């Protein structure tokens, strides 16, 4: 019942969580986020979760500090106290062949605009 | 009756509080803040809130890991202790589906602002 | 506001910015922020480091 | 401030425009560099 | 709208609370 | 124990027995809230909305 959705190029894991029986969705990162803090924030969202674990189904525990992009290709088995969930990642399409240089030019240019805007209150912060 | 308006680049959300029944406003950075920091700010500013949580309008709860601006692309339902608030003024403006035209808008505004300040004279004044 | 004493306080106002230019600059700020959020720059940014 | 006496202690010892100029040149670095390369 | 009634020897005062706007009672 | 415990002690025990609970209350047969320092025997006179 747990689904993984790409929103803005980011995985969104919506989980049917315990006692307050809701869907809670998690906006993640492939690189900067890892399993060791994903499980930390999953334990944060419901304090009553006793034992939480995750593993590829042949494994017994996928390792802590596993890259989430390594996990975004395989059917991990998500483990909650009473509940198990082996679920799949969706497909990630790409136009990084002929729109690559154009879109990366746009990414570089807007990042230069953002570091034009944000640098002034960071220089003084770093000085303090 | 929750509104949000962009004052000087920052979203200024304004919200009704239960204790003392005064409307309060919250100016928050779209980048350095998560929604968990915002809910800490709600329960920190006025301690009359037992439970607060942010619902995406599909009933799914937005957990405390996402970015603010990632949540500001959508409208969303804010739940103070009993009163709910579907807040929809975040001014979703990127309906163009063309990034290059938005950069044309960017350099249009930048050239307009470059001209209206007569800033090239200020730069020559700096060199002088 | 202190205990039942509403001291209405003003600053000595210095504007140093026109209103139309403030609106244009606010539009620039919010538009760059919305595009930063839209095309997920920080993902590509950390991707270069990786 | 002590109870009676007073030490006059003597120790020894725009902003929008700069931002929008950096913003203006940020739009027009790449074409300027591509011209200057040739 | 605050009342107080003597239930079984103790004053049971009942009072409105701001947060959640529920009336609460206090036996003291 | 009705002779020693108040409502708040029972509610903190119910609080610590789990962790995924944040809001607990004991209401009247009416809508009003029984406080924390109320004795249990006064609460066990009648029913209650837990």
What whole-number distance in Å separates Cα of residue A46 and Cα of residue A81?
12
- Neighboring chains of A (3 or more beta-carbon pairs < 8 A): B, C, D, F
Report the run of H or E that residue C11 belongs to, with start and end. Answer: none
D17 to chain C nearest CA, in Å? 10
- State the residue for tokens 């106290």: A81
- Judging contacts by C-beta atoms under 8 Å, the chain B residues touching residue C19 are none
- List b or e across B55-66, with b for residues whose CB sees 16 or more CB atoms inside 10 angstroms: bbeeebbbbbbb
What whole-number distance in Å separates Cα of residue D18 and Cα of residue A116?
10
CB atoms within 10 A of CB E24: 18
Cα distances (angstroms) measured from residue E24 to each of A86, D38, E13: 47, 81, 9
* Helix, strand or coil, per DSSP, at residue B4: strand
- Judging contacts by C-beta atoms under 8 Å, the chain C residues touching residue D21 are none
Nearest CA in chain F to E8: F42
Nearest CA in chain A to F19: A48
- Which residue from D16, D17, D27 is facing B110, i.e. has the nearest CB? D27
F25 to chain E nearest CA, in Å? 11
A17 secondary structure, DSSP code: -
In the numeric block, which tokens belong to residue F13? 């025990």
Nearest C-alpha neighbor of A10 from the set A55, A63, A69, A56: A69
CB atoms within 10 A of CB C20: 11
Burial class (CB in 10 A: 0-12, 13-18, 19+), F47: exposed
- Judging contacts by C-beta atoms under 8 Å, the chain A residues touching residue B104 are none
- Judging contacts by C-beta atoms under 8 Å, the chain B residues touching residue D32 are none
- State the residue for tokens 């999953």: A42
Residues found in chain F: 50
Q: Where are the beta strands (DSSP E) in chain A?
A: 3-7, 10-16, 23-27, 53-55, 77-79, 84-86
Q: Is the Cβ pair F21, A46 closer than 8 Å?
A: no
């Amino acid at each position: 019942d747990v689904t993984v959705v790409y929103q803005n190029g980011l995985p969104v894991i919506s989980v049917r969580l315990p006692s307050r029986r809701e869907r809670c969705q998690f906006t993640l990162k492939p690189i900067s986020d890892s399993v060791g803090v994903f499980l930390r924030q999953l334990q944060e969202e419901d304090r009553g979760i006793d034992r939480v674990a995750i593993y590829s189904p042949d494994g017994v525990r996928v390792a802590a500090s596993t890259g989430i992009d390594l996990l975004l290709l395989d059917d991990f088995k998500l483990v909650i106290n009473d509940l198990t969930y082996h679920v799949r990642p969706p497909k990630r399409d790409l136009l990084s062949h002929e729109n690559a240089a154009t879109l990366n030019d746009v990414k570089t240019l807007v990042q230069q605009l953002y570091t034009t805007l944000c640098i002034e209150q960071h220089q003084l912060n770093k000085e303090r």
